């Protein structure tokens, strides 16, 4: 019967699909989390740069003024 | 053979067609999200640099 | 017998794999190429905007002087 | 022949799954690495620009007004 062929194929297609897409999902999650981490670390580094720069600037403005 | 040929060709097309599709669909959704957090990140930086430069100048002028 | 099963299995396995990877590769090529253009485009914006704020800045430090 | 069909069904599913997962894994590592490096190369890009910006802005104010 082509019913038996259709059926056996779909069983195999489903199992292979399920277990392939499950693994590729887990790998994509891990990559998403790690890129976010990367992004925050990047933002934090930048916001420190701005803090130091704003401070050094205001310090220098202050020294100009006191003259 | 007619059977084994039929089953073999069937399994191959079917697994290939459906795996490609399911990963593709899944990729479109991932590549969309990764591009958004990417642009969100740029929007974040931009807005922060805009604001701090505006505060720098408004400082400078106002103090001098 | 098993050799035959084993042979059908290596054939199916390789036909599928080659087709799937040849697909997820071409896909990853597009996305890579697109995140690069987005990355550079976003760099060009931030740079212009810094130029514009350096000009405003010099204009200001030029007036404070006058 | 149930034993033959069974035998063939098991091996195809194990092997196709094993072979595909492994290739995509391999493709993904190579692929993820290149997103991640392009990403940090872009962040470095911004950083060295802000370092140089802030440094020039600093030098101007001190040279002009101090």
What can you see in these coordinates?
Four copies of one chain form a homotetramer. Chain A has 67 residues and is mainly alpha-helical. Chain A has one helix and no strands. Chain A has one helix spanning 2-65. The N and C termini of chain A lie far apart (99 Å). Chains in contact: A-B, A-D, B-C, B-D, C-D. The interface between C and D is medium-sized, with 32 and 28 residues. Chains C, D: It comes from Bacillus cereus (strain ATCC 10987 / NRS 248). Chains C, D: This is HTH merR-type domain-containing protein.
What is the helix tally of chain A? 1
How much strand content do the residues of chain A show? under 5%
| Greatest contact between two chains | C-D, 32 and 28 residues
> Tell me, what's the shape of chain A?
rod-shaped
Largest sheet of chain A: none
Structural class of chain A: mainly alpha
N-C termini distance of chain A: 99 Å
Write down the oligomeric state.
homotetramer
| Cα Rg of chain A | 29 Å
Number of strands of chain A: 0
The helix/strand order of chain A is H
Helix content of chain A: over 70%
Protein name (chain B): HTH merR-type domain-containing protein
Organism (chain B): Bacillus cereus (strain ATCC 10987 / NRS 248)
PDB class: dna binding protein
Keywords: DNA binding protein, DNA segregation
């Amino acid at each position: 019967n082509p019913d038996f062929i259709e059926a056996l194929t779909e069983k195999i297609t489903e199992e292979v699909t399920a277990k392939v897409t499950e693994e590729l999902t887990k790998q994509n999650m891990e990559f998403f989390a790690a890129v976010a981490k990367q992004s925050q670390d990047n933002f934090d580094r930048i916001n420190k740069r701005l803090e130091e720069r704003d401070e050094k600037l205001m310090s220098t403005i202050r020294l100009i003024q006191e003259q």
